[PDB]
Design a binder for these strands. Structure first.
Ligand SMILES: [K+]
Ligand SMILES: [K+]
Ligand SMILES: [K+]
Ligand SMILES: [Mg+2]
Ligand SMILES: [Mg+2]
Ligand SMILES: [Mg+2]
Ligand SMILES: [Mg+2]
Ligand SMILES: [Mg+2]
Ligand SMILES: [Mg+2]
Ligand SMILES: [Mg+2]
Ligand SMILES: [Mg+2]
Ligand code: NA
Lengths: 183, 58, 141, 71, 130
RNA sequence: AUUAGGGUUCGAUUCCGGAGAGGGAGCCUGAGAAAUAGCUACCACUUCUACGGAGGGCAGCAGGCGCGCAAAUUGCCCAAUGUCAAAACAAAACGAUGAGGCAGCGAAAAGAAAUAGAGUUGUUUGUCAUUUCAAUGGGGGAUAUUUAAACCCAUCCAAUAUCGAGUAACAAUUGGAGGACAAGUCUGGUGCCAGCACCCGCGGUAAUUCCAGCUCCAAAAGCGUAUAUUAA
C-alpha cells in the first residue's frame, strides 16, 4: 500500500504449446547451452522481440528523423558493446537479423566455456554459481550475465576462490581438520 | 443403482510401485534428455523416431 | 452494403448499437437475465448442503449411471444437481454434508453425456474431493 | 452563433452548430448547442441572423452571455 | 596459489565536505580488507580513520551505514568527524550516541505512556500527574 | 489487460477531483464545518444502573462477529518521510502522531536462481557397473555487520586462532501418452458395469481412452480446475 516500486515480466510462453519442430529446436538450445528450463530461451526471445520491434519502428521513419537518428545510434551502440552485432555492420537493418544464438553466445556461462575456464558448458554454470568466476575483479554468480566485449578480456578466476589466490575449499579443509583431530 | 460405486477401483489388484534410484532434477535432467535424444541416438533424418517403443505383444 | 458518407458517423453508431444485440454472447454478457437465472449468481464456485444422492442415466449411445448429488446452495437456497467427478468418490459424500461445487467447464452448459448437469463437486467437508480420492487427506469426523 | 428564437423579452436563444468527430468510424456527426443570450435593445436581431456573444456574469438561471454585435 | 598474510585494513575517504553549521566533516568511508575473516569492526575503522585524519580523540568520529560489497573485500559507509566531543554529543542522534556509549537511557514503553495519558484525560487538576 | 493495424475490455483500490461517517435533519464555534474520535433532536439498534439516572457510534489501526468462492498482528517504533505546535539541538531537561515507517502473516503478482561437476577402469560412441577427485551451497555459527532495536540481506569460517553432502536420503512436483496435442498396437484388472471424455469419442471380454504397474511425454518450484475478460 502506497509502494511505487515498479516490476514487470521478462518472458512469454509460446502460442502453440506442442510443436514438434519448436520443441526439438528448444531442446537443441537447452542441451547446447546448459539451460535449466525453457524460460531462459523465452526470456531471450522476449528481448529479441523488443529489439526487433524497436528496429522496425525506427526503420519505418525517414532517415533524417531525429528520433530515428538518436535511437538507432543507441541501439547500434548497445548491440556493439554487448557483442550481439559485429562491429563491421552498422546499419539499422542488421538488428532485425539477430537470432537467439547470438545472445546465447554472450552469456557468462558460454563465454567461460569458450574461453576455457571450464571443460564444458555444464561445468561453466557450476563454476559461476559456486563463486569461482570474477569479471573485472568482481565475483559474478549469475550464469545469464551478458558479457560486454570490453569485459571479455578481464574474465578470470576469482582472487577469493581456491582456483586462485583464495584458501583451500571444503574437501581439503575438512580433510585437514580430520587430520588435526586424528593427531 | 448407487450400490456399484467404486466397483472397479476396489476390484483392481493392488501393485506397489518399484523403488528406483533418484533421477537428475535440475538442468541435469535436460542434459540427460539432450544426450539421450540428440547425441547418443544419431539416427539419420527421414526415419521416424519412437520416444517410447515397446516390446511386441499380442 | 453500408453507408460510406463523411458525416455518417451517427448512422454507423446507431447501426452498430442495434446490431450488437444479435450477438448471443454480447447480449448474454450485457443482460441480467442470464445472471439472474444462474444459480451461482455470477460466482466461480458456490457452497451448498448435500440434500440427497442420485444416479443420472447417461444419454445414448452411452449407457451408465452417473453419481450426482442434489444440493441446496446456502446463499440463494436454490436446488442444483452436481456430478461427483471420480469413481468411488460418492462414498465420500453423505447427506447434509457441507459441499463446495464449481462449474463443469462449459459456462452454464451441460457437459458430456450427463443430460442436465452443469456442476461438479470440488470439495466436501472442507477437504478436497480429489485429495480424498488420491488418499492425500482424510475426511474429518 | 445564429439566432434561433426571439420570443422572450430582451432575451434570445442562439444555436451553435458543429461537427463532432467519432474516432472509431473516422467520420463526423452534426451536433448543436442551444444557448440563452441576453439581447440589449441596441440590437434588433431576427431568427436566422448571425450574432457574436460575449460571456458575462450570471444574469439569470440560464443566461451567461450578452449580444455584442449582429452580423 | 594462496600465501598466508596478516589481515590488513586500508581506509579511504570520498566525497569529502566540511560544514561549519554542524561543526563536522562528512565523507564516505570505503575500507579495503582483502584477506579478512568477516566484517571490519566499526571501532577498528574508527581508530584507523582517527589516526589517518590526525584527530585528537577517536571518540569524536562517528561512523554508520556500512554495507559490504558482494564478493567481499570492501565495505562502504558514511562518517563524520566533529570539531570536539562536545559538538559530537550535542549534534549526534541519540541512537548513534548509544552505539558510541554516550546515549540516554531508554524511555518507558509508549503503550504505557498512551494509557497513562488517556487515563489522565478524564481528570481535573492535582489528580493527574500524581 | 489484450491487441499487426483498427479495436475490445477494466478501473472499489496508492496520485488528483467528488461524496460520506448507522440513517435523516438542524446547528454552534471558527478564517474555513452544515464537522461527526463537535453539539441538538427524531428513528433504528444498542451499554451501564444502587431504577432515580447515565451512555454509544471502527466506511482510523490492530482485532472480533456475521456474510460469503473470497482477503493478514488486539505486533515494534517515531530512526526516516511529513503534519500540528508555545517548539532547533544540547543541557535536572528525548512534544505528540495506528499519518508513516519496521517486522509478523502472505505460491495475488514480478525478478534471480539449487537439486550436482570433472574424470579412471572395465562394460566411434554412448550406456551401464565401478573407481576416484575436488568444489559449493542449504544449513550451523561469528571479530562482527545491519537495524530505532531487531530482522533479513551481504561478509567470513583465521588475521595467531574459526564448522559442515555421497543413496551428495539434503531423495520435484503437477498434469498427460486414440485425435485435436508432445508422448505406449507394453502388461495386468474391468466388461455399455465401474468409470472416462471441454469436443470427437472410449467401455457390450484379445479397452491405443476406464482402475492399476512399468515406460515415455510437457511444463517445472511449480502444475491442475472453476468463473470472468482480451486475443483467436
Ligand atoms: K507488509
Ligand atoms: K430497542
Ligand atoms: K478495522
Ligand atoms: Mg461496490
Ligand atoms: Mg463530510
Ligand atoms: Mg457501519
Ligand atoms: Mg454530521
Ligand atoms: Mg471513529
Ligand atoms: Mg449519530
Ligand atoms: Mg530437494
Ligand atoms: Mg479446459
Ligand atoms: Na481520495
Amino acid at each position: 500500500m502506497r509502494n511505487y516500486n515498479n516490476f514487470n515480466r521478462v518472458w512469454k510462453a509460446p502460442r502453440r504449446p506442442f510443436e514438434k519442430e519448436r520443441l526439438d529446436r528448444e531442446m537443441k538450445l537447452c542441451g547446447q547451452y546448459g539451460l535449466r528450463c525453457k524460460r531462459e530461451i523465452w526470456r531471450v526471445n522476449m528481448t529479441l522481440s523488443k529489439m526487433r520491434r524497436t528496429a522496425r519502428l525506427l526503420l519505418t521513419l525517414p532517415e533524417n528523423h531525429p528520433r530515428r537518428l538518436l535511437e538507432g545510434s543507441a541501439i547500434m551502440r548497445r548491440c556493439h558493446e554487448y557483442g550481439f552485432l559485429d562491429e563491421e555492420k552498422d546499419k539499422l537493418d542488421y538488428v532485425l537479423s539477430l537470432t537467439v544464438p547470438d545472445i546465447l553466445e554472450r552469456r557468462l556461462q558460454t563465454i567461460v566455456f569458450k574461453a576455457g575456464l571450464a571443460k564444458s558448458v555444464h561445468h561453466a554454470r557450476v563454476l559461476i554459481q559456486q563463486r569461482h568466476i570474477a569479471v573485472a575483479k568482481q565475483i559474478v554468480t549469475i550464469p545469464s550475465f551478458i558479457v560486454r566485449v570490453s569485459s571479455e578480456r578481464h574474465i578470470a578466476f576469482a582472487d577469493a576462490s581456491p582456483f586462485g589466490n583464495g584458501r583451500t575449499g571444503r574437501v581439503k579443509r575438512v580433510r585437514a581438520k580430520a587430520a588435526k583431530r586424528h593427531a | 443403482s448407487l450400490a456399484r460405486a467404486g466397483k472397479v477401483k476396489n476390484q483392481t489388484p493392488k501393485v506397489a510401485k518399484q523403488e528406483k534410484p533418484k533421477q537428475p532434477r535440475g538442468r541435469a535432467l535436460k542434459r540427460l534428455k539432450y544426450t539421450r535424444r540428440f547425441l547418443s541416438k544419431t539416427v539419420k533424418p527421414g526415419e521416424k523416431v519412437h520416444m517410447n517403443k515397446q516390446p511386441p505383444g499380442k | 452494403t453500408k453507408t460510406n458518407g463523411q458525416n455518417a458517423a451517427r448512422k454507423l453508431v446507431r447501426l452498430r448499437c442495434r446490431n450488437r444485440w444479435a450477438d448471443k454472447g454480447w447480449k448474454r454478457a450485457h443482460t441480467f437475465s442470464a445472471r439472474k437465472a444462474n444459480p451461482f449468481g455470477g460466482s466461480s464456485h458456490a457452497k451448498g448442503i448435500v440434500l440427497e444422492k442420485i444416479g443420472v442415466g447417461a444419454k445414448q449411445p452411452n449407457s451408465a449411471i452417473r453419481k450426482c448429488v442434489r444440493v441446496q446452495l446456502i446463499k440463494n437456497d436454490k436446488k442444483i444437481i452436481a456430478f461427483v467427478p471420480n469413481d468411488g468418490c460418492l462414498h465420500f459424500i453423505e447427506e447434509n454434508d457441507e459441499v463446495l461445487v464449481s462449474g463443469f467447464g462449459r459456462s452454464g452448459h451441460a457437459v458430456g453425456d450427463i443430460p442436465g448437469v452443469r456442476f461438479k463437486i470440488v470439495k466436501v467437508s472442507n477437504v478436497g474431493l480429489y485429495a480424498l480420492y488420491r488418499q492425500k487427506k482424510e475426511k474429518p469426523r | 452563433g445564429v439566432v434561433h428564437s426571439t420570443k422572450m423579452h430582451r432575451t434570445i436563444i442562439i444555436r451553435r452548430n458543429y461537427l463532432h468527430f467519432i474516432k472509431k468510424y473516422q467520420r463526423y456527426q452534426k451536433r448543436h448547442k442551444s444557448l440563452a443570450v441576453h439581447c440589449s435593445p441596441a440590437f434588433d436581431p431576427k431568427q436566422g441572423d448571425e450574432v457574436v456573444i460575449g460571456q458575462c456574469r450570471p444574469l439569470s438561471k440560464t443566461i451567461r452571455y450578452n449580444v455584442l454585435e449582429v452580423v | 596459489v594462496f600465501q598466508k598474510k596478516k589481515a590488513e585494513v586500508c581506509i579511504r575517504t570520498s566525497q569529502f565536505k566540511v560544514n561549519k553549521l554542524l561543526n563536522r566533516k562528512q565523507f564516505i568511508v570505503e575500507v579495503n580488507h582483502p584477506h579478512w575473516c568477516g566484517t571490519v569492526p566499526t571501532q577498528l575503522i574508527r581508530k584507523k580513520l582517527a589516526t589517518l585524519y590526525k584527530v585528537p580523540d577517536a571518540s569524536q568520529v562517528s561512523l554508520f551505514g556500512f554495507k559490504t560489497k558482494f564478493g567481499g573485500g570492501k565495505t562502504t559507509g558514511f562518517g563524520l568527524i566533529y570539531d570536539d566531543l562536545a559538538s559530537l554529543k550535542r549534534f549526534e542522534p541519540n541512537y548513534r550516541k548509544t552505539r558510541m556509549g554516550f546515549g540516554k537511557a531508554r524511555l518507558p514503553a509508549r503503550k504505557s505512556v498512551k494509557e497513562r495519558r488517556n487515563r489522565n484525560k478524564k481528570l481535573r487538576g492535582k489528580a493527574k500527574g500524581k
